[PDB]
Amino acid sequence: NAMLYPLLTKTRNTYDLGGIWNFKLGEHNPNELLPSDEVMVIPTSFNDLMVSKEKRDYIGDFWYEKVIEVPKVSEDEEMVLRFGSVTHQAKIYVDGVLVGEHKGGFTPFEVLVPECKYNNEKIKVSICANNVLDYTTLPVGNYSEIIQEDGSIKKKVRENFDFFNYAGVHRPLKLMIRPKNHIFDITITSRLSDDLQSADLHFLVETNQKVDEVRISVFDEDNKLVGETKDSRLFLSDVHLWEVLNAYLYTARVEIFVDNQLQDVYEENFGLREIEVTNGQFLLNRKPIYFKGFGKHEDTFINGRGLNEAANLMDLNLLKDMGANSFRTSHYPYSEEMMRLADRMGVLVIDEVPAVGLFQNNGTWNLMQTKAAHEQAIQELVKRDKNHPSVVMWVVANEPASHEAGAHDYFEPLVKLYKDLDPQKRPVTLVNILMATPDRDQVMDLVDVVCLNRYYGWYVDHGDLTNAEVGIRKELLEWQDKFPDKPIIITEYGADTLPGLHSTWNIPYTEEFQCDFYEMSHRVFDGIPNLVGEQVWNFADFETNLMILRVQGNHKGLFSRNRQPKQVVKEFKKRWMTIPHYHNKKN
């Protein structure tokens, strides 16, 4: 119900509630006043702000509480609390009274403030956040409890994924004043003409009550009116297409009227671009695209998984400079701010739900109770991002046990849910793990694009690039042979590389070996006609939990965690600026 990005309009007052909140790790009664003994920032992960390991490793309920002054609310208006996200679970309280809940730490949700408080001077907002992950949540965790022999139970979450379980309120919290009779949702679809000069637009505006008129004004990038409609349909000539690294955005100003007066107004951006997957190719605007980019992470020093718009722009500027053109929201939906940035900069985005960890240590599909959370995640993501021209593909899961029995039955309705909910019917994919090699895999028949995470030379044939090349070329041909019409994209491939580590003997973990690894990989990729994309793992080093294979987090980044480059960055820029975005390898 809150998939529309929060705006300041003539009918919508949007206030930011970010800043210092009273904080507590542990139990709390929302009817009681949380003291200011401990405080916390919104938005940010709380973890790296804790000095001790004990508090940084906390699992369970943790509270945010602050008294907010009530703004003027008219009779025909309603006041809601719009969360960008709360990680992972949340129960929201107003004056000690439960007013909303949400499960899933990477999707936005709104909560209605009771009308009986609109004339009060202040309201106390309490946020009960929860970072527990188990077999019912996305992402998947291994939950356990141990008795401290002190009388209390201590919770632990052994992650089923390769990234640190950062938690907290990671995205902006807004106090929204909006009309009771308001615009609920906007869907924008287009059919491009045969000459790509015209477009048949369709605006599906959802309301909660009914209005006499639904007016839509369309403006270009010069803020010039180019179209008007009251019947949810509009034809437009002299269109400017949204292009890769050359974006063009229109704005649809939607106005609803009752008795000839404005009830609510909203502005939704959109881009004109065509997507089609056919004949082992990914077509953008009817031209073959070669994906060049990164698997990423919402990860930065200090803030952790918290929003940092400066980081987004810095990352995307580096992406553009290297000659790259895309990235994947691994392994969870990123902030709306990032998606809007990608729209504005013309960066292709592979959108992904938090479906990572669907893998036992078998009998995975008798153990995974994630169906409910998986369906909601797909519902929320599509509803939130369906209008983004940057979003070009959906991901049902990252490295699930797609070789075990019951896998095909699990994913078929989920792939279908993507196809049913997305009005653009964009391609959906499943990110494949090495254990699910062509013969054993039983799910890749459901998707439109084959996405592979392969580490020949790092995990398999470690430090053995000679035999790694034989192995990767062998399997890529197997995939291409099993699905002759499906395009292939490498979504993950890389090697842990610590800055400063050097050698003349192609030694793993050194900067030179990272260069050698990618050079070999690309030699193989360029020989596969159906391979239409390469996305490295990762853009930058990121935090993980404690595992012997992890040398203080993950170091497969091309850049360090401070966005400083490694040796391999210079090499990628040469390759990526040589290969055009529109690149046909069928010739």
DSSP string of 8-42, one letter each residue = --SS-EEEE--EEEEEEES---TTS---SSSEEEE
Instruction: Between 175 and 443, name the residue whose CB sits nearer to a second copy.
Output: 175
Q: Binding residue for a second copy (CB under 8 A) from 1, 15, 226, 585?
A: 15
Q: Binding site annotation covers 537?
A: yes
Q: Which of 524, 533, 332 is nearest to 452 (CA)?
A: 533
Strand-pair category, 173-179 with 97-103: unpaired
Q: Which of 322, 348, 293, 290 is nearest to 587 (CA)?
A: 290
Instruction: Between 143 and 509, name the residue whose CB sits nearer to a second copy.
Output: 509
Q: Does 76 bind a second copy (CB under 8 A)?
A: no
| Structure tokens, 95 | 């004056």
User: How many C-beta atoms lie closer than 10 Å to residue 303's C-beta?
Assistant: 20
Catalytic-residue membership of 213: no
Q: Binding site annotation covers 58?
A: no
| Structure tokens, 171 | 């995205």
Q: Does 222 bind a second copy (CB under 8 A)?
A: yes
| Structure tokens, 79 | 């006041």
| Structure tokens, 372 | 């409910």
Q: Which does 454 bind (CB under 5 to 8 A by kind): Mg ion, a second copy, none?
A: Mg ion
Contact stretch for a second copy (CB under 8 A) within 5-13, 134-142, 352-360, 473-481: 5-13
Catalytic-residue membership of 298: no
In the chain, the amino acid numbered 296 is K
Strand-pair category, 183-192 with 199-207: antiparallel
Quick note: the x/- pattern for a second copy over 317-356, rule CB under 8 A, is: xx--x---------------x--xx--xx-----------
Q: Binding site annotation covers 453?
A: yes
Q: Which residues contact 177 (CB under 8 A, 6 or more apart)?
A: 12, 13, 14, 15, 71, 73, 77, 78, 79
Q: Binding residue for a second copy (CB under 8 A) from 35, 96, 413, 527?
A: 35
In the chain, the amino acid numbered 472 is I
Q: How far is the CB of 525 from Mg ion (least distance, A)?
A: 7
Q: Does 572 bind Mg ion (CB under 5 A)?
A: no
Q: Binding residue for a second copy (CB under 8 A) from 29, 71, 230, 286?
A: 71
* Active-site hit among 77, 255, 380, 492: 492
Q: Binding site annotation covers 296?
A: no
Q: Which residues contact 555 (CB under 8 A, 6 or more apart)?
A: 496, 497, 498, 509, 541
Q: Does 370 bind a second copy (CB under 8 A)?
A: no
Q: Does 472 bind Mg ion (CB under 5 A)?
A: yes
Terminal alpha carbon distance of the chain: 47
Q: Which residues pair with 460 in a beta bridge?
A: 456
CA distance 75 to 69: 18
Q: Which does 302 bind (CB under 5 to 8 A by kind): a second copy, Mg ion, none?
A: a second copy
Instruction: Between 306 and 487, name the residue whose CB sits nearer to a second copy.
Output: 306
Exposure of 573 in the CB half-sphere (CA atoms within 13 A): 13
Which residues contribute to the site for a second copy (CB under 8 A)? 7-10, 13-16, 18-20, 33, 35-36, 39-41, 44, 48-52, 67-72, 121, 175, 221-223, 247, 249, 267, 300-303, 306, 308-314, 317-318, 321, 337, 340-341, 344-345, 500, 561-563
Enumerate the active-site residues: 399, 492
Q: Which residues are annotated as a binding site for D-glucuronate?
A: 162, 398, 453, 459, 492, 537, 556
